[PDB]
């Protein structure tokens with residue numbers, strides 16, 4: 207896997223469109239090593255290709271596969287506000303669930 | 318090593334540049350036959366390369382204004398037809414053609 211980060215922030219829908227444009231997908235860390243690689247390419251909080259949109263508290267990648275490795279920040283995922291179904295990788299490498307409508311950088315993944 | 322990825326949609330050069338730069342990459346510029354073939358592997362149709370003779374006609378440079386060495390022009394190219402062809406695309410046979418920068422083609426981005 208190759209990981210590339212965007213320079214501008216955008217909502218999840220636009221983030222997916224960007225990675226898909228070059229035939230990749232939004233980065234989904236499968237272990238601690240990939241998590242670090244993605245963190246390093248991201249210069250700020252960035253979207254990961256994980257959501258619990260289909261079923262609340264059931265986090266899966268953009269292809270519907272349930273995720274095994276997780277690296278949630280203490281207190282997360284909390285689904286606050288009116289709901290948070292998308293996921294971002296914080297600058298310390300931990301994860302936070304956020305509104306998919308909010309704007310963040312995006313790290314795309316390619317094979 | 319360099320990694321090459323092709324776009325799904327067609328767009329003019331300036332948009333092609335913006336797309337590759339969005340992920341901090343550049344428009345693919347083959348420096349030898351091996352790279353030219355690697356770009357061929359990912360491009361399913363005619364695609365832009367990061368080369369232009371915008372500064373001086375018939376003097377080809379990469380997008381950073383660095384004059385290129387390796388070229389793989391299709392027979393009869395570059396011909397600067399009509400109002401002018403200052404951008405370059407990789408044909409489906411691996412050879413190159415100069416085309417109008419305002420015309421739309423797929424784009425192959427390069428990363429390292």
Ligand SMILES: CO[C@H]1O[C@H](CO)[C@@H](O)[C@H](O)[C@@H]1O
Nearest residue numbers: 394396398402414415416417
């Ligand atoms: C007629 O113009 C088109 O075809 C010629 C070759 O026939 C190319 O040189 C040119 O860039 C266009 O693609």
Ligand SMILES: [Ca+2]
Nearest residue numbers: 258285290291
């Ligand atoms: Ca949720």
Ligand SMILES: [Ca+2]
Nearest residue numbers: 284285302303
């Ligand atoms: Ca949260």
Ligand SMILES: [Ca+2]
Nearest residue numbers: 370397402403
């Ligand atoms: Ca020309």
Ligand SMILES: [Ca+2]
Nearest residue numbers: 396402414415
């Ligand atoms: Ca031509």
Ligand SMILES: [Cl-]
Nearest residue numbers: 290291305306
């Ligand atoms: Cl949401």
